[PDB]
From a paper:
The main replication protein NS1 plays a critical role in cell cycle arrest, transactivation of viral and host genes, and replication and package of B19V genome. Based on its similarity to other parvoviral replication proteins, such as Rep72 of the adeno-associated virus (AAV), NS1 is predicted to contain one nuclease domain (Nuc, aa 1–176), one oligomerization domain (OD, aa 201–270), one SF3 helicase domain (SF3 HD, aa 271–501), and one zinc-binding domain (ZnD, aa 571–671). The SF3 HD domain of NS1 belongs to the SF3 helicase superfamily, which unwinds DNA with 3′→5′ polarity. Totally, four cryo-electron microscopy (cryo-EM) structures were determined, which revealed the detailed mechanisms for ATP binding and hydrolysis and DNA binding and unwinding by NS1.
Based on these observations, we constructed and purified the NS1_200-501 protein, which is composed of the OD and SF3 HD domains. To further verify the assembly of NS1_200-501, we also performed cryo-EM study and solved one NS1_200-501/AMPPNP complex at an overall resolution of 3.5 Å. In the complex structure, NS1_200-501 assembles as dodecamer. Indicated by the low RMSD value (0.7 Å), the conformation and assembly of the NS1_200-501/AMPPNP complex are very similar to that of the NS1_2-570/AMPPNP structure. Like NS1_2-570, the size-exclusion chromatography profile suggests that NS1_200-501 exists as dodecamer. Although no DNA unwinding activity is observed for the K334A mutant, WT NS1_200-501 can efficiently unwind the DNA. The DNA unwinding activity of WT NS1_200-501 is comparable to that of WT NS1_2-570.
Author numbering:
A (entry chain L): 202 to 278, 286 to 400, 407 to 499
B (entry chain G): 202 to 277, 286 to 400, 406 to 499
C (entry chain F): 202 to 278, 286 to 400, 406 to 499
D (entry chain E): 202 to 279, 286 to 400, 407 to 499
The structure:
């Protein structure tokens, strides 16, 4: 398609540069804007013709970082010193293979399997890892914040959705399968998928119907999930994980060979394969 | 009727050019505009008087492509084509089917405004429906609309799709109007017929009423439908039929002789006739 | 368990004989009592005490014919000339095998497959055969009488449930599966065996209505509970109404013959009803 | 079917006698009993054990005169030109004998689907007078005008005749009206277990009302269930009111004559009723 012949004035052009400035600094909310740059926020809000541009610039900045720029481009900025690499080795999982899946999963390239699942006993790093990734994406939603009756609202404009320590009820089991499967919502189709990560101590394939466990949806939920078993406690020295840990870890994994990935990626298994001593990278051996 | 004499200004002329640009590139929604041309969208939304033009232009662009211009103009080796293989495998004359679609999509079949695809599952019923539905300017689906109010938002569409449809007694009287091409009562007082395609694994002539099927409406529905039997299963690798195949197929059907179709057009039959080995046009014999 | 040692008076014994009389003559409703025995109905309703026995005797009479007696006994009592035998031959189904399956199905001995499904084009004897079976059992009720949003009320206390020209919606699809599979309703568990179901339809009922669409998520589950018969061959318009004498004669004849093939199939029930084997047909039907 | 051999006491026998007395003297309502026999009515209500017998007697009396005894017997009584009914039918160019032989079949539900009589024409032609005359003769009769507007067909069972004076059919009730006009029992009666109908009108009732608009979609289906008589010639102003004595005399006379003229018309039940043949009219009416 040929771009339109229209030419913008200096006021319109300066607005365009402001939209580009917002994306380049990851400023996607009004509260974030005030902290990052209060002088420009004060100047813009001086008039009704300027306070309008505050709303419009944020709606366009969100769209640019969500539907035009792939999310992985935000994640790409001694490997053994990185806390995430140590954590995945403590859980007996290959740090390279997990990292390569995250790049594919956050880009919605996995097809139906749009859902991750960190499963294990309490205090094993499940919430920390999930929140660390969520901090490194432009905008992320959360089921816990939403209404208890409509947990799957406000999914548009989110590059990621975090469902921490959640359980699937029968009243929302049908809406869950749509979101977990990456299928766009019926409302989205009429008015026109987001990666989902779940942490849990119990098996979420058991749907809560009334006061009774049900296993009707066991197969449907497994076709959409990839499960990681976090069954080993982490030393308290781990503390809180930073965004730079994710960026360093994912940048290294992207530059390595992908050959091991598509071999497993041909047959998407519900459970993530464990460590094999043959396929370990020499840097981690 | 002579057009109004008064000429416009530079600002209004540029808006008119933008409207003609939207129709050319088949941009009828804001999301389609952002994906195609984010630059012009950003500049327009720099002011209140600019974001007004975005809403005003799209409403005129949709109206131009639906009411002022015939839909067939947006629709426009022969054996190699996937669709003609699909039609021949079902033992239906490809020239007759293509010549019917052009007259049907233009709302010129009188009372028989509705096509119907019937047959066993996985025989390409929905695949062909989407191919035609994706080529028209704007298409709507009964699935998207509200469960108890399925025929809202039917104006402004070039085609309405009813996939896996079943006619309930609560909407059977509303369905008969839209199936026959009769304009809706609200459309009358705020002032016009849209083609409908139905794909179903079952005989939709059977109307559901409670926990029981009734045939009192069978004769009336047969007056408005045209039926195609997709009985033979197709190749497992048929693939997604695209806009290019529809444009190729209908263009060839338009070029050939129309005398054969007008014999059938004199009296419309509920069942669509099959191929005659000698009446088949020499490009396909 | 030993019955209680107590004995009744003259009045209590006469009431017991009245309850037995209702079962023999199949009087399970007041309207049936009025048609048959108006004299005894007039004598009983002459007082408030007597009118109580009318309501109470029907409760025990219906219960005896539904729980204390197998339903096959009320079905039992030239075979080629039987109209049902003619109907099953036109549709290419073995009369001996159909009858032998009905007897076990009407007695809830088929396990999961508690449902019979008749399918075919219109005017093929689907309702006729179903109605004849339905009117031969002591008490029958149809889904077509119940409320639209509560199709399965009054199911308990019946010998058969008929669902004529029926279709399954996603709102009741969960309630339907329990009854079709013979699983007792939740309310029955906390207030205390299912009821055999026969369904006739011109379309495929495995498809489940949801909104204005069709779905097959319940297609596999429903097939585990139903046995399907294909009523495709057009019948002669002068076949007429199938009667109880046709049903009783047909089932009694099937009960008399050997079951040898039936145990072979009954090892693993299939969804579709198997067709006729020309060599396995009984010589009395040849 | 052998009746139960239980024999009641003296008190129960007397109640049975009182049931036979109510049916004999056409006493079917509480008020009618007070007019006909106040001495017995006072005696029964002297105690609670007695005032219960009153309700049970009326329930059985209405049933015996509606569901067990044919209605035609009560229309019959236990110069023909002297009857004012024949005068009315002659003016409308209708053979008086053929009309009477039809009523004996229409009131007994024997006319198949064509269950409802329709009287049509300009005002003051005796449509209501004739219809109310037959209505007053049957044991128990109900009217649609008495029932509430939203549910016109409550309390239909237990009635020997339903009258619909100057009626109009709305689309909200057209589906329910089709069953009662066609003689089909309603859904309620089927689960808890045919009434002749007469309609008079100044206009075409087949024009079903729908909103502020008149539609003809149901006209063909309604015509399948009605018989029409066109009352056009205005009667003499001194017509008076038709009585049950005239209905009993006219209908009894029509029973005695031959039926071959009517039995031939029953071969094809047309919508309109045939007119007078100048030479086929019975000699007594000449
Ligand atoms: N805010 C924090 N500050 C310091 N250390 C933290 C913090 N959050 C988590 N940790 C450390 O991270 C490790 C596990 O934490 P966490 O991710 O919360 O496990 P968890 O599985 O989510 N607990 P649970 O929610 O019950 O499943 C421990 O070593 C904690 O000390
Ligand atoms: N997205 C797709 N990509 C490739 N092939 C497809 C796709 N969708 C359908 N097909 C093929 O199209 C053929 C028929 O599919 P489909 O159009 O879905 O039939 P269908 O009638 O819609 N099934 P049903 O809805 O149950 O009646 C098969 O050979 C499929 O493999
Ligand atoms: N009451 C009846 N009187 C006369 N013939 C009857 C009657 N009931 C059924 N038949 C005949 O029985 C045959 C099949 O009728 P029926 O059993 O009603 O098929 P059907 O499946 O119920 N029709 P449909 O509901 O459209 O599928 C036809 O030849 C009918 O004429
Ligand atoms: N109770 C009565 N006493 C005397 N004359 C009566 C009585 N009822 C009706 N008539 C007469 O009977 C004739 C016919 O009137 P009627 O039977 O009421 O027709 P109608 O159908 O009621 N008029 P309409 O309802 O407008 O079509 C008239 O001459 C009336 O005066
Ligand atoms: Mg946690
Ligand atoms: Mg499909
Ligand atoms: Mg039927
Ligand atoms: Mg009047």
């Amino acid at each position: 398609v040929v771009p339109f012949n229209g030419k913008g004035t200096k006021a319109s052009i300066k607005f365009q540069t402001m939209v580009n400035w917002l994306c380049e600094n990851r400023v996607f909310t009004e509260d974030k804007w005030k902290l990052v740059d209060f002088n420009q926020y004060t100047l813009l809000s001086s008039s009704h013709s300027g306070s309008f541009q505050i709303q419009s610039a944020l709606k366009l900045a969100i769209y640019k970082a969500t539907n035009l720029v792939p999310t992985s481009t935000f994640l790409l900025h001694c490997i053994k010193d990185n806390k995430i690499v140590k954590l995945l080795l403590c859980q007996n999982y290959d740090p390279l293979l997990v990292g390569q899946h995250v790049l594919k999963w956050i880009d919605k390239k996995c097809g139906k399997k749009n859902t991750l699942w960190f499963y294990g006993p309490p205090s094993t790093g499940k919430t920390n890892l999930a929140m660390a990734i969520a901090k490194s994406v432009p905008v992320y939603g959360m089921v816990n914040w939403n209404n208890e009756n409509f947990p799957f609202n406000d999914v548009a404009g989110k590059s990621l959705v975090v469902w921490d320590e959640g359980i699937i009820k029968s009243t929302i089991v049908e809406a869950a399968k749509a979101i977990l499967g990456g299928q766009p919502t019926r409302v989205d189709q009429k008015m026109r998928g987001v990666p989902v990560v779940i942490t849990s101590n119990g098996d979420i394939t058991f749907v809560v119907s009334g006061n009774t466990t049900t296993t009707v949806h066991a197969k449907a939920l497994k076709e959409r999930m990839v499960k990681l078993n976090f069954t080993v406690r982490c030393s308290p020295d781990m503390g809180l994980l930073t965004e730079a840990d994710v960026q360093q870890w994912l940048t290294w994994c992207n530059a390595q060979s992908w050959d091991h990935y598509e071999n497993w990626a041909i047959n998407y298994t519900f459970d993530f394969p464990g460590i094999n001593a043959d396929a370990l990278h020499p840097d981690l051996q």
